[PDB]
Design a protein around this nucleic acid. Structure first.
Ligand SMILES: [Ca+2]
Ligand SMILES: [Ca+2]
Length: 210
DNA sequence: CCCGGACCTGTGACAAATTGCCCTCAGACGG
DNA sequence: GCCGTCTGAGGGCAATTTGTCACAGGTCCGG
């Protein structure tokens, strides 16, 4: 199945995207890399890759596409829009999109890589961000270890405001997304908390391959 | 000494958002 | 040149997940 690769600058960028949008974004990076910024999406192909009906694919593409407008991307800083023209459909079952050409060098650069079958069952978009950030540190054999700062997680994944209260951070983000990765990917993941005084400051992740 | 305050934790509620499903009906084409 | 079928563009749903905050109970310090 298709092998996604992307510059680390994208793995660690600040942005907020939905799941359907992140799915499309993988195909855009794939199209661009296989060579102006103009990409294309087929309803029937999206449906087959991610196991949807054609109808639900259509719904997913259309709403994802109108939710890109006004969205911006920050590289740590410098801000860019994803799209510089609205999407449009020349043919039935076919969409044309215009990615910001200044983003191309940030897509292709110190890199992260994974096969698309690894992530296509994840549902929570914050868990997709987390799985991308672990892959950036993976060894050939399939293991790794990394320390991510809690303040940096909040900024980069643009977590919502009540998750700055740590018991809520634990309950609705950390525990749920570590559970998804262990249930929906071939990865097996564990963690431990680093503290300073009363405050918890980092999360230390270790993982191996099944 | 206590006591109140500034911190920290987990849980029960409720509100808003997202999920996979289901149904209708016209577009595009082949045979 | 018409119709039978495969698509996909629309309109919705209830059941779950995700986002928010009130309240109870831990600690340590300065007064
Ligand atoms: Ca969201
Ligand atoms: Ca959907």
């Amino acid at each position: 199945s298709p092998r996604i690769v992307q510059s680390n600058d994208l793995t660690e960028a600040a942005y907020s995207l939905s799941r359907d949008q992140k799915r499309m974004l993988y195909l855009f990076v794939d199209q661009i890399r296989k060579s102006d910024g103009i990409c294309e999406i087929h309803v029937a192909k999206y449906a087959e890759i991610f196991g949807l009906t054609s109808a639900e694919a259509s719904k997913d593409i259309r709403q994802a596409l109108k939710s890109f407008a006004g969205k911006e991307v920050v590289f740590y800083y410098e801000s860019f829009p994803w799209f510089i023209k609205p999407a449009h459909s020349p043919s039935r079952g076919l969409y044309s999109v215009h990615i910001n050409p200044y983003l191309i060098p940030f897509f292709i650069g110190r890199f992260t890589q994974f096969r698309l079958s690894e992530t296509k069952e994840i549902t929570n978009p914050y868990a997709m961000r987390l799985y991308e950030s672990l892959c950036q540190y993976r060894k050939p054999d399939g293991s790794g270890i990394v320390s991510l700062k809690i303040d940096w997680i909040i900024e980069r994944y643009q977590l919502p405001q009540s998750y700055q209260r740590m018991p809520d951070f634990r309950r609705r983000f950390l525990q749920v997304c570590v559970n998804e990765i262990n249930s929906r990917t071939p990865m097996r993941l564990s963690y431990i908390e680093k503290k300073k005084g009363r405050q918890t400051t980092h999360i230390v992740f270790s993982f191996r391959d099944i």
